[PDB]
Design a binder for these strands. Structure first.
Ligand SMILES: [Mg+2]
Ligand SMILES: [Zn+2]
Ligand SMILES: [Zn+2]
Ligand SMILES: [Zn+2]
Lengths: 46, 67, 115, 42, 50, 49, 50, 48, 260, 524, 446, 49
RNA sequence: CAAAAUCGAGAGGA
């Protein structure tokens, strides 16, 4: 439900709901990145 | 981007000889001399050290995504 | 995409028999042993040992395709012998040779390490 | 004073390194654009 | 012409030295090998030529 | 605006600054960005006037 | 130094003179003989033919 | 017509002899040599 | 129609390599020993990774791959363990595998070097090699101020016929008839050719005179290790493995003939 | 020459047979710097070299060097009236002085080449179409394309795990920055006929070298999408759909998506899955699925998901997926001398032919690629590379350089305990016995070209079809068909095979029935 | 059901230039992701493995399968109607090897023989008697190839290096050099095998076997040659090195002396023409006669140097090994790699004066020497000086454009002829007729 | 229409992919990857056989 | 129960 992003510039977590314009609330930066999932991928060191 | 663990051909470990090779280099040893210090005999292993291009150092300039 | 798994080279698929004996109607006293999941490492030693026997008229082996994992061995013996017998005796003598060699290597290690 | 034949083979490469330090490889694009903006618009 | 000359009666006695059985076999052979050279009808010789 | 030219923001910046802008020190410039794609004007021959 | 059988060369020549005048291998000579409309439209110049 | 597609004598030093696209644009696309520099233009008043 | 009587004479032994020679045996047998040193001696090696976090400049597959190729110490355990296919336990269990961990975060303004010293193993007999008590550790990744790497990986038993990370050696050098007596190679100019380290010839003479009767004996081996197994242990495991292969094949053959 | 009123780039010709003088200042002229010559002597004295050698303290740059009347830009038209010394040796009074009234010199001959032709080492031992192909294949060679690739949403990108600088390298490569963004690896190549799988421009790679990271790559591919609210009539939106509300849903599950409708980084996507759940409001009710799927059968891992607002101000998204590409049978590998070829087979370390110290090769190429092509630079590169790797240098392959020739490399090589001409005795890895010939082996620089077989395998058995004429679509992307053109039809008419022809051109493509009046023959 | 082993598939490569560019193969399912083909069958398709691709069709009926199997199969197509010679023969490594296997002094052991006989499919089973029983049992290479040869065919050829005068004098039937192949009762009595004996010539062993035996016998003949000889080349090996591109100092001196001679003669001719001492030949102006004489001088020089190089080579040289066997390359390649690259023509003439009476600005005006107009006096192993590099680039560019601009017109001609002749066919009357049913030939080919 | 959709046309049951040497196949055999075969089919008529 | 447009330009591959 929260869907935290990362402010592309100030690297600050900030939590945004749907239908809300993307805008950082520390520095106004417009680009943001999803966070790494929590599921479990296995790798073969091969 | 970073020093391979094993020589591709023979499989001898050269992962643990990069920083040492550089330290030898700045001690004013030649490439040949430094390479004979570290015990790389075959020209395959020496090919591995002598032809490395350490790019990871560049990538440690750009600041991370998640601070 | 079409990369076979790496353990196909040595793990027997279910239902496949390790070794599979045939006759050879080409000539008398010949057989074709087909061994699954093997390669030149055992083929060459078995063949070379067979050629030491003087009752073996023809021994050879081939790997039909590099990308499948079987060998074929063709042994032909004199009429008073039998190629299954020859095969078994070859493997027996290879095992004895390896056992003796392992012992002698142990003794040499003990010596040199002890100085 | 004169560059003897044995020093020439690195004289020329000092010179070429100096050239490529001054200019670069894609100087022609950048210089043409500077011309256009500086003058031809006016 | 070619057959009649190579397969002569003098050449066949001074060059090839065939025997009667050999000659009979040879004649049967020439007949068959000729009869298998003939064009098969329905052959598209136009596309072949082009 | 052609990149790295006199009216680009990366003109005169030092390498440390470029890295701190996520811009490659080695990227030579000399192209345009039109809708976030990189376009390059290919030189054209023609007869002398 | 190449080689091509004779059957093919003869067939091309005979196709190309079979009507008494020299026929060119072009839409002018091939497409003007009596081949029937559909083959003609296949070769070249479809619209005019049909 | 292959006349404009050939390597001319006059490309020495200016255009690279080896680098071309070997399809149908052959000889029609070219790369500058290394030190070749294309002039940018000047005003003929002071010379005159 | 009966076996050979090989003899072994050992010329060097270190922790790096063994230099020995077999003698009075077949070429096929010698080269099968050589092939076994490479491709059928089993050792331990990470082959299951799970990246719980990674900010480093290398993607996840890169780190996994680069972890598999760190030699671990397989000295006395690899005989005790089971192939996970052969273990009746679940995915993992102390009979079939060994668990590693790694959690590293960077705080200083100077680059931290993650290395094999930061791999902590569950089992004390199995550890990275450089860690074992000179050569530094295998640099896995560098983390500037901010990045953080945390994962958890498992080590299993395999051999080099499956993947090159389970190959224990680092170059088998093999030779026979050091002077070209048998003429198994025809030099167009035998004088241009440097002499062998094992050759026994005066410098004027280039190659030995042809010997029509002889065939190869006296193969010269020089086995160098990577660190998982000490060399003599490699050789002993190899002889055991080749012998066991042949034992299994003979059992199968008896079954088949019995059936026929 | 004094940088006076006449700027440097002012061409100035003097036609002499006819009596004109011509001066140009226009734009577009091409020119190159040359050295200026006195009576028979350069004006470039060692004063200048001394001051340039510390170019970083004295700020005695190139500009001070043109400013002092030493170099000069001479263009394509003024060259018609100069006399160029190739090298300062042409200046030397010869027994029969060739011209003896030179005007300029070349700085160096090897600067008549370009950015891709300046990679080739020993280009002057190669036949010219070889150099031209390598120029064209050096632009397809996966390397590191840019230092900051971690922040770019290029549509496609290939990055090589372990790129290595060449051990044999022209001096022009210094200024192309090829030593910092290099596009290949050094291999131990052997030129041998070995088992037959490297015939006709195909190579034998090693599987053990490949399991240690050799020529591995990562392939990145980015996917756009934007929610268009162009009208209240129909508007898109990111939202995890459901089995009940959307109409055009494939059978592919939608579970991997997040609440916002975008898959998260670190999720192992397979082929034919959903990366963006986008539902357009309908006029399975009130919304139709417009989800974005992956390119079929790709199987990457989500790399990162950037979200932002476009110019007009709707949501924008870029998902980047990462697929790792291990080399395999069918991948195209090429060297710097126009020697391209796919991989034919891979052998493990113990099946490759080894040396008296167990140096198995990385790559085995056919000895038949050489004589028809006449790429001798390949062999000199291998020889020089062996010398260099035993000596601890980086050789010099710059084209026209009299100080390096085969006899010197060979003498240098004989001193490291090697046959001078590079040959070695290899043993056969399958059976252990020596090989009767001596195989030529040494270190060579290869590239990995972008053309991988996994992007070319295709197969169709009754998929989708075009809407106008119900014939298969075209392309691998569209699950398309392969064209049975007119030349194939002619070939099969020659064959005489009319049933197969009918089947291809009727039954495999577009069968159909129609009812026709027996009287007018127009479709009833 | 999914396509399985043994299905009949048609197999195509584009451009489809003749009926051998589509052929029916049998399927064999394999691990990796490429269409693995045999090697003999790359001549019909005109393929190589530098990134080529090929299509695969699957007939969908018993009608179509039977038709393909009975008409379009690869064995059935070995001899072509276009020129009545086999269309696929032996190729690179097999060809070089089999030339080597069959040299007079290739003696095989016992274990080696039994290895090689494991790869003969059509092996009766019985080991033949060695050619030498004491002191050691040794077979030879002719003696194994005689097991490969099918049936009882009978053939005569002559190796490429056969000294043609040999057949005149004595020793006609015991060749000192082992040329003059003679197969006789299906047993290689003597001779070395090469392109002239196993290639696509007419009357080769592949052709005679086709005509005499079936096409299944010949199919097996191809397969057996390939497999047996690859598994010998494992023992024998083949390379090409630098050591093959070198010549001794004596022959280098010969080559340099010849070049010096030729350049001196060209200087002499030039100064004659400068003194008005040169007079035209019939049908040619002064310029043309001058050029023709200079070109003749330089071409003779190139030939003499090439001969000196070719003769300098020892019999282990691998260039010569791949040239004599026919496998790859020709003697001009050896000349250029060792001796001298020769003259670079651009449209059949020497390099043109593109500057103002200069080929380049490094030469003085009106310079007609050999260097000025583009004579490369260097091998590919000695390097090329920068001007030779440029002129060589110009020549290569001519070649590239030619390859890239011929194709359109030829393709048009192929299309146009096809549409012209397509529907002519041989009838049950035995006549030849077109679609309109008019006579074109009363009998096919007269 | 004619030369593009009656004389030549796109067809079902057809694969494309790269060719690679293989000395071990007879001259009338071809090697086909597992995925190509898994994808393409052939209607076999059921009989008591 | 089949879901996924067309038209122009450019770069490539054999
Ligand atoms: Mg090709
Ligand atoms: Zn912020
Ligand atoms: Zn090594
Ligand atoms: Zn377990």
């Amino acid at each position: 439900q929260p869907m935290i992003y990362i402010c592309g510039e100030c690297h600050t977590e900030n939590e945004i709901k749907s239908r809300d314009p993307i805008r950082c609330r520390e520095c106004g930066y417009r680009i943001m990145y999803k966070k790494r999932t929590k599921r479990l991928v296995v790798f073969d060191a091969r | 981007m970073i020093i391979p663990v094993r020589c591709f051909t023979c499989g001898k470990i050269v992962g643990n000889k990069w920083e040492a090779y550089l330290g030898l280099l700045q001690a004013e040893y030649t490439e040949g001399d430094a390479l004979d210090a570290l015990g790389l005999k075959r020209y395959c292993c020496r090919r591995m050290l002598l032809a490395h291009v350490d790019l990871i150092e560049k990538l440690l300039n750009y600041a991370p995504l998640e601070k | 995409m079409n990369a076979p798994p790496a353990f196909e080279s040595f793990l027997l698929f279910e239902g496949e028999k390790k070794i599979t004996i045939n006759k050879d109607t080409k000539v008398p006293n010949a057989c074709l042993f087909t061994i699954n999941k093997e390669d030149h490492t055992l083929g060459n030693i078995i063949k070379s040992q067979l050629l030491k026997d003087p009752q073996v008229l023809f021994a050879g082996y081939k790997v039909p395709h590099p990308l499948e994992h079987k060998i074929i061995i063709r042994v032909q013996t004199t009429p008073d012998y039998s190629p299954q017998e020859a095969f078994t005796n070859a493997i027996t003598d290879l095992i004895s040779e390896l056992s003796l060699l392992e012992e002698r290597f142990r003794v040499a290690i003990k010596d040199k390490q002890e100085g | 004073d004169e560059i003897t034949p044995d020093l020439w083979q690195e004289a020329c490469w000092i010179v070429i390194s100096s050239y490529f330090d001054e200019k670069g490889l894609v100087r022609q694009q950048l210089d043409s654009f500077d011309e256009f903006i500086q003058m031809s618009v006016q | 012409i070619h057959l009649r000359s190579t397969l002569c009666s003098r050449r066949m006695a001074e060059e090839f030295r065939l025997s009667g059985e050999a000659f009979d076999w040879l004649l049967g052979e020439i007949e068959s090998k000729f009869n298998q050279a003939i064009a098969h009808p329905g052959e598209m010789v136009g596309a072949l030529a082009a | 605006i052609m990149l790295r030219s006199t009216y680009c923001l990366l003109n005169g910046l030092t390498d440390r600054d470029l890295c701190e802008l996520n811009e490659c020190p080695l990227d030579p410039g000399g192209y345009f960005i039109i809708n976030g794609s990189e376009k390059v004007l290919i030189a054209q021959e023609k007869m002398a006037t | 130094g190449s080689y091509v059988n004779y059957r093919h060369l003869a067939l091309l020549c005979d196709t190309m003179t079979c009507r008494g005048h020299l026929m060119a291998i072009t839409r002018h000579g091939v497409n003007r003989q009596d081949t029937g409309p559909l083959m003609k439209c296949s070769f070249e110049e479809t619209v005019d033919v049909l | 017509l292959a006349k404009p597609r050939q390597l001319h004598n006059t490309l020495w030093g200016m255009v690279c002899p080896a680098e071309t696209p070997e399809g149908h644009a052959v000889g029609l696309v070219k790369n500058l040599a290394l030190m070749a520099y294309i002039s940018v233009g000047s005003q003929p008043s002071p010379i005159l | 129609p009966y076996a050979n009587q090989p003899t072994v004479r050992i010329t060097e032994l270190t922790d790096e390599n063994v230099k020995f020679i077999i003698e009075n045996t077949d070429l096929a047998v010698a080269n099968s020993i050589r092939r076994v040193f490479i491709a059928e001696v089993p050792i331990i090696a990470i082959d299951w990774v799970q990246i719980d976090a990674n900010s480093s400049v290398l993607h996840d597959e890169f780190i996994a791959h680069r972890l598999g190729l760190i030699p671990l110490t397989s000295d006395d355990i690899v005989d005790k363990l089971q192939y996970s296919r052969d273990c009746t336990c679940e995915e993992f269990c102390p009979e079939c595998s060994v668990e590693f961990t790694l959690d590293v975060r960077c705080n200083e303004d100077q680059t931290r070097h993650v290395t094999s010293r930061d791999l902590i193993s569950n089992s004390p007999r199995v550890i990275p090699v450089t860690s074992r008590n000179e050569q530094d550790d295998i640099l896995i990744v560098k983390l500037r101020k901010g990045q953080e790497l945390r994962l958890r990986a498992y080590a299993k038993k395999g051999f080099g016929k499956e993947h090159a990370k389970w190959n224990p050696t680092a170059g088998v050098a093999f030779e026979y008839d050091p002077d070209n007596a048998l003429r198994h190679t025809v030099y167009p100019k035998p004088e241009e050719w440097p002499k062998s380290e094992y050759s026994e010839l005066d410098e004027d003479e280039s190659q030995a005179p042809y010997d029509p009767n002889g065939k190869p004996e006296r193969f010269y081996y020089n086995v160098e290790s990577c660190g998982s197994l000490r060399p003599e242990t490699i050789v002993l495991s190899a002889l055991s493995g080749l012998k066991k292969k042949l034992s299994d094949l003979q059992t199968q053959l008896s079954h088949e003939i019995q059936s026929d | 020459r004094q940088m006076d009123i006449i700027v440097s780039e002012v061409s100035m010709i003097r036609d002499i047979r006819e009596r004109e003088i011509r001066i140009y200042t226009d734009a577009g002229r091409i020119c190159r710097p040359l050295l200026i010559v006195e009576k028979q002597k350069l004006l470039l004295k060692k004063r200048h070299i001394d001051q340039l050698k510390e170019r970083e303290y004295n700020n005695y740059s190139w500009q001070d060097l043109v400013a002092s009347g030493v170099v000069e830009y001479i263009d394509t038209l003024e060259e018609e009236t100069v006399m160029l010394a190739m090298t300062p040796d042409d200046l030397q009074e010869k027994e029969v002085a060739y011209c003896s009234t030179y005007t300029h010199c070349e700085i160096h001959p090897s600067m008549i080449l370009g950015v891709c032709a300046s990679i080739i080492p020993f280009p002057d031992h190669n036949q010219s179409p070889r150099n031209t192909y390598q120029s064209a294949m050096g632009k397809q060679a996966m390397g590191v394309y840019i230092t900051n690739f971690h922040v770019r949403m290029d549509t496609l990108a290939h990055v090589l795990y372990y790129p290595q600088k060449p051990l044999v390298t022209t001096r022009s490569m210094e200024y192309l920055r090829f030593r910092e963004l290099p596009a290949g690896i050094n291999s131990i190549v052997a030129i041998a006929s070995y088992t037959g799988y490297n015939q006709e421009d195909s190579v034998i790679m090693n599987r053990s070298a490949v399991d240690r990271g050799f020529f591995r790559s990562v392939f990145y591919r980015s996917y756009k999408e934007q929610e268009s609210k162009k009208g209240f009539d129909q508007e898109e939106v990111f939202e995890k759909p459901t089995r009940e509300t959307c109409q055009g849903m494939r059978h592919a599950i939608y579970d991997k998506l997040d609440d916002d409708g975008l898959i998260a980084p670190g999720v192992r996507v397979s082929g034919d899955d959903v990366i963006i759940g986008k539902t357009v409001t309908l006029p399975r009710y009130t919304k139709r699925d417009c989800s974005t799927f992956l390119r079929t059968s790709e199987t990457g891992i989500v790399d990162q998901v950037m979200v932002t607002l476009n110019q007009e101000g709707y949501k924008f998204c870029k998902i980047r997926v990462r697929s790792v590409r291990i080399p395999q049978i069918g991948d195209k590998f090429a060297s710097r001398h126009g020697q391209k070829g796919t991989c034919g087979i891979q052998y493990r370390q113990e099946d490759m032919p080894f040396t008296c110290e167990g140096i198995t090769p990385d790559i085995i190429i056919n000895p038949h690629a050489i004589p028809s092509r006449m790429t001798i630079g390949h062999l000199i590169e291998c020889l020089q590379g062996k010398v260099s790797a035993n000596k601890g240098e980086i050789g010099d392959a710059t084209p026209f350089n009299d100080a390096v020739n085969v006899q010197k490399i060979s003498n240098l090589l004989s001193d490291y305990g090697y046959h001078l001409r590079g040959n070695e005795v290899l043993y056969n890895g399958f059976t252990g016995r020596k090989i009767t010939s001596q195989i030529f082996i040494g270190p060579t620089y290869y590239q990995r070209l972008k053309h991988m077989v996994d992007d070319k395998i295709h197969s169709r058995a009754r998929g989708p079809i075009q809407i106008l004429n119900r014939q298969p679509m075209e392309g691998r992307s569209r699950d398309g068909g392969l064209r049975f053109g007119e030349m194939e039809r002619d070939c099969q008419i020659a064959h005489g095979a009319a049933q197969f022809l009918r089947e291809r051109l009727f039954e495999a493509s577009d069968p159909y029935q129609v009812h026709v009046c027996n009287l007018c023959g127009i479709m009833a | 059901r999914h396509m399985c082993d043994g299905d009949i598939v048609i197999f195509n490569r584009q451009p489809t230039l003749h009926k051998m560019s589509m052929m029916g193969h049998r399927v064999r399912i394999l691990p990796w992701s490429t269409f693995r083909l045999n090697l003999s069958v790359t001549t019909p398709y005109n393929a190589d493995f530098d990134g080529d691709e090929m299509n695969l069709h699957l007939p969908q009926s018993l009608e179509t399968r039977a038709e393909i199997q009975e008409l379009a199969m690869v064995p059935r197509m070995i001899v072509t109607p276009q020129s009545n010679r086999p269309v696929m023969g032996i190729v690179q490594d097999t060809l070089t090897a089999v030339r080597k296997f069959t040299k007079r002094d290739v003696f095989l052991e016992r274990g080696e023989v039994m290895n090689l006989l494991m790869f003969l499919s059509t092996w009766d089973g019985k080991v033949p008697q060695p050619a030498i029983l004491k002191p050691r049992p040794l077979w030879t290479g002719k003696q194994i190839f005689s097991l490969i040869i099918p049936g009882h065919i009978n053939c005569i050829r002559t190796h490429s290096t056969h000294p043609d005068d040999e057949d005149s004098g004595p020793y006609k039937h015991i060749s000192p050099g082992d040329t003059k192949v003679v197969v006789e009762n299906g047993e290689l009595i003597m001779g070395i095998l090469c392109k002239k004996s196993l290639g696509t010539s007419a009357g080769s062993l592949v052709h005679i076997s086709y005509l005499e035996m079936g096409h299944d016998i010949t199919r097996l003949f191809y397969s057996n040659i390939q497999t047996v000889i690859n598994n010998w080349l494992l023992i024998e090996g083949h390379t090409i090195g630098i050591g093959d591109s070198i010549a001794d100092s004596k022959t280098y001196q010969d080559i340099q002396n010849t070049i010096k001679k030729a350049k001196q003669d060209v200087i002499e001719v030039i100064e004659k023409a400068h003194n008005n001492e040169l007079e035209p030949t019939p049908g040619n102006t002064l310029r043309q006669t001058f050029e023709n004489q200079v070109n003749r001088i330089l071409n003779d020089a190139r030939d003499k140097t090439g001969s000196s190089a070719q003769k300098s080579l020892s019999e282990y040289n691998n260039f010569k090994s791949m040239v004599v066997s026919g496998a790859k390359g020709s003697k001009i390649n050896i000349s250029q790699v060792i001796a001298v690259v020769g003259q670079q023509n651009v449209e059949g003439k020497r390099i043109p004066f593109g500057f103002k009476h200069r080929t380049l600005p490094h030469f003085i005006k009106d310079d007609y020497g050999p260097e000025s107009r583009g004579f490369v006096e260097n091998s590919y192993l000695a390097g090329l000086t920068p001007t030779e590099f440029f002129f060589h680039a110009m020549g290569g560019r001519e070649g590239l454009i030619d390859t890239a601009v011929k194709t359109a017109e030829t393709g048009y001609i192929q299309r146009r002829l096809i549409k012209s002749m397509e529907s002519v066919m041989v009838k049950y009357d035995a006549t030849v007729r077109n679609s309109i049913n008019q006579v074109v030939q009363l009998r096919y080919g007269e | 229409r004619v030369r593009g959709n009656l004389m030549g046309k796109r067809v079902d049951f057809s694969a494309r992919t790269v060719i690679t040497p293989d000395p071990n196949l007879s001259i009338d055999q071809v090697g086909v990857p597992r995925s190509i075969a898994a994808n393409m089919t052939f209607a076999e008529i059921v009989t008591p056989f």
